[PDB]
Amino acid sequence: VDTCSLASPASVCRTKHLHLRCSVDFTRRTLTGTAALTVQSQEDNLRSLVLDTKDLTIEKVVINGQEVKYALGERQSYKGSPMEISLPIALSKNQEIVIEISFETSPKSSALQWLTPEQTSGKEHPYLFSQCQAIHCRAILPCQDTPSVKLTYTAEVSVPKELVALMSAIRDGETPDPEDPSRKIYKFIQKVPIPCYLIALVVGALESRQIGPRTLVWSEKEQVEKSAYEFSETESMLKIAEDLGGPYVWGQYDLLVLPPSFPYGGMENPCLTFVTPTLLAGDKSLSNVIAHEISHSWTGNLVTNKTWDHFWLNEGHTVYLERHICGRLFGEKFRHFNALGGWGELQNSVKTFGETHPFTKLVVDLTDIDPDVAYSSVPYEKGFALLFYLEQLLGGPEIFLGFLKAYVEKFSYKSITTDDWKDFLYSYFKDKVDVLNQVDWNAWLYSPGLPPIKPNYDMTLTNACIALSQRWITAKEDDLNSFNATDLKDLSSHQLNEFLAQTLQRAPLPLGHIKRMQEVYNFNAINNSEIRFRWLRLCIQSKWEDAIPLALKMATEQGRMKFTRPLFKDLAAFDKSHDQAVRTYQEHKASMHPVTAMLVGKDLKVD
Template sequence: NRKIGPRTLVWAEKELVDKSAYEFSEAEAMLKTAEDLAGPYVWGQYDLLVLPPSFPYGGMENPCLTFVTPTLLVSIAMIKVIAHEISHSWTGNLVTNKTWEHFWLNEGHTVYLERRIGGRLFGEQFRHFQALGGWRELQNTINTLGDKNPVTNLVINLDEVDPDVAYSSVPYEKGFALLFYLEQLLGGPDVFIGFLKAYVQKFAYKSIITEDWKKFLYSYFKDKVVDILDKVDWNSWFHAPGMPPVKPTYDMTLSNACIALSQRWIQAKESDLGSFSSADLKEMSSHQLIEFLALLLLEAPLPLSHVQRMQEVYNFNAINNSEIRFRWLRLCIRSKWEEAIPLALKMATDQGRMKFTRPLFRDLYNFDKSRDLAVKTFLEHRASMHPVTSMLVGKDLKQDQ
């Protein structure tokens, strides 16, 4: 282990411990910011444990000892995941959902706090940029699951349903969207963080359901019940599948460059491909590159010539950042680029984070040229996968019922 702050050690295999200490050096700054937003950190120690690559999640918020994936060590999403797991020290571990039907209470509030930390560290435009990225992630999930699928409800019915099978970005991003929408309705970020702090104090060390949260919201904002809260379409937010009934307002400053470049590629004809160059990305941050690729993934697959040209001018194959590489390889497979098949299979099996492994395997299965190889590769690697990953990829690839 290495000490990286007054209350934080990072633990890892010895080959990774120095790199981990360097990458997670901001943990104390994030803890202090979270305390400022949500109240005192009650757990004493806050350590980080870097797990083997087969660990199926980005992070797991065990009190005092957050488990994290080693894929964060080559990813600028590291700040996001650590801010998320730190935030769980309040929303999730201090105030907890009583049953998995109300999982959004843990995750929606935690994403909200995580993005508030990001806003403090990198500015309000960055918070809005991350929030809009979350909205796109939700669109992507609902496109995959289907907009009538009951597992896309915010409060879901889990009778006879395994919570692992129902797990998706919905409780995170639909939950966040509701809180972000309420923030905008009820007086802005400063007003709403007051509510969040009071909510944590009120329900500390308790397990609650959505109705408890809603009653407290109504009592905290009692002067805004008739004018604002009663006009919210609670039934659609909680109990309807698909996208939320209302889209919050987002500051578009950091998103506009991503939208403009993605539209250029979508609208480009063969004769326009020469107009793209490496200079297109010069002013863009890694976060914006992720968003650019995410926007393309929401559209119909690009022609093969377009992704080949993209590789020529941007050389995405040389990027190790896991968030960028994952989206780039999905784009290639969806455009039926056979040369990308071994790269996508390698990423799907070199690590076992379900956020990456499941969509890559699904895309490979949907491409006729890689379907058999995807199944064969999965069966070869299955024994070394985490049981949850193995079970869910097995269902995705129609190997298990």
């Protein structure tokens, strides 16, 4: 049962295809058009069905060329409103019909951000982008908004002719719009069945540059060169991913670099991964995010969580493949370094929610929970920990990668639950079932807090970070003189980040120590978003007022929730900045991404 969806479930009927014809109206901030769903009955004598919607205006529903009766139920908060549609003729099992729904989105669609020209790089044109995962596709169009259903799609999108439309699909040409020559229609086809959370649309003043045999980078003109360099490892990462996962089935793997309000690091939209511009560090140092989105082309997009309770299936396996990709490129020691870091992120999350909190469970129960409220590192790192522990239990990376590849093959084009996964794990490792029966499954899958067992991690690259962090924490005032820029000499950006993360775990430090850290290390000058984030957090938690404007500026000039939410929370927790934090949020709220607005709102207890 999908407790996040109000649509008829896959046992009742299944959408096989969507043909989307819509027009993007920047003057009204609406998407208007028709969603033609090819729906297959799974039942005898089916006479109605239910679709998810959220803030949609339905004009009509047409089947067999005639308008039919439909009703919208009462709004169930973050789930939207159920749309019941009366079929004109009763369907037998496996019969397919086409249901054409005429609709319009609300300007408040939780799926969309509409950007004015001033909020873009070029300042001459507006921009639109979507984010459907988890349950925001219903805020674009009526659908069975559950990852238990997989469908192909085609689309025709009319935009002002100066602008470019892209989607999670193969581009299939453009033409002037016959109805209005100030506009273009862009066409798209996605021939691989996908869950509807992978439907994506961007419209903006976009340009492309080729960076590999199957990859174009897309962004506004002013980010293209920087982006092409930053993500130049992409093809080499696809080749490793193919080796680990089997053939890449999606044709193209393009990248879109979004404006700074993009709420996440990446979104694995098929054919067209969306990424944050906060990745543009200048040195390819945050490319693990690319490895991650690439890996979803197998774990997530081919094998998909059946409901959101099983999201760890998506993330855990994708983090596991991500860290193998980075392991191949940069060495096994580095894979271990990143793995150990991820454990520290898991410790942070468990400490934030609390060690008995239901959101710290691997398999969560989202009955009456807004998935955006539950989202965190837990599914990622507790998932990864589980798999890393099993790798060590079952004979090492090369054995467990055999299982990962067999798993992808087994469940390609399907949606699956934690039990499906466990079942296949046991099947595959039948000769090691006694090892498998020593796993505390109930604890790992269903209990809150840190996992019951911590894997083994190589420490080589981590040691220098911990040693410096510990020097700083145990320092007294008379030790501060001994710190010097040479401390950082043999530390990569990755180790600087980890040094900061270690230190942040014991924050606050004395204000005098933090001021000295700036004095000798000049962290204020570093524009790597991961480093700068953790450094400003350490400054604000250690009560340095000079960091207030730096933290406010970072929180607002970009909108990646990973950074924007804790910066605002920290600024609110600090009495000197508390009022500015609330004021800044209230002043930016209308121009923020709707999900980010909502969550920063709850975090600050404002409204």
